[PDB]
A and B are shown apart, each in its own frame.
Chain A
Amino acid sequence: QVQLQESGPGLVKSSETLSLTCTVSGESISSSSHYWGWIRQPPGKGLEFLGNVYYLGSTYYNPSLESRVTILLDTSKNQFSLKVNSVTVADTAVYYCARHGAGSYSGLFFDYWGQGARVIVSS
């Protein structure tokens, strides 16, 4: 079983970088061979993919977000961190951590999900 916890600030000043981290318990990122990815849920709206990071460090970003997001993979502490730059009022929602893969559908469908992390961008 894979438990996913997010942590970081819950309030960030506008145009200050946002940083969350997801510490995965129950697997080992280095030897699991699965993709790990983020999505975001602006309030009362549909979830939008942010990007994922393959266990060797390769990374895909969502072009909608314009080169703000950066997904760092810290493999030794078994956690990976989302960083989005120049935050705005619009970029506030609950950020979910997820394991992007399974045997057949690796890097496709999100089977195991974080508990969720509220982030409110404000001045």
Chain B
Amino acid sequence: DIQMTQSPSFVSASVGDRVNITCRASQGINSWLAWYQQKPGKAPKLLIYSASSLQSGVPSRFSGSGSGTDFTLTISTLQPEDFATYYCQQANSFPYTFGQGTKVD
């Protein structure tokens, strides 16, 4: 397997303030990633696919550009609507692995 470690485990950052969550793959994943968002108790929902390509449903504020060993999800102009954990996924090699979680406040 390939480990995934999101550097902030719990990042308390309030409304309006820019936040960035970073998760580093154990080995190069060739920019294959998938940030997710889970509000408590509901199933997660995709946010960014591949490295920087935004999903149709998600608001413009979410963004992130991976260099392939390093990845960041920058929530810009954080609105109160989303306080949730954030997971990242590798697509590079089986088995797919979602590292830890980043709970934001």
Contact = CB atoms under 8 A, between A and B. Distances in A.
Interface in A37-62: 39, 46-49, 60, 62
A62 B44 contact: no
A49 B46 contact: no
A109 B43 contact: no
B10 interface: no
A109 B94 contact: no
Given A47-B98, A49-B95, A108 B44 contact: no
Q: How big is the B interface, by class?
A: 20 to 34
Contacts of A116: 41-43
A109 B1 contact: no
Q: How big is the A interface, by class?
A: 20 to 34
B49 A105 contact: yes
Contacts of A47: 44, 87, 98
B25 to A, nearest CB: 14
Contact of B34 (A62, A108, A114): A108
- Chain B contact residues: over half helix, strand or loop, or mixed? loop
Interface in B39-75: 41-46, 49-50, 55
B100 interface: yes
A111 B47 CA distance: 9
B43 A115 contact: yes
Interface string A80-117: 00000000000000101000001011001111011110
A63 B99 contact: no
Contact of A113 (B1, B34, B44, B91): B44
B32 interface: yes
Contacts of B42: 116
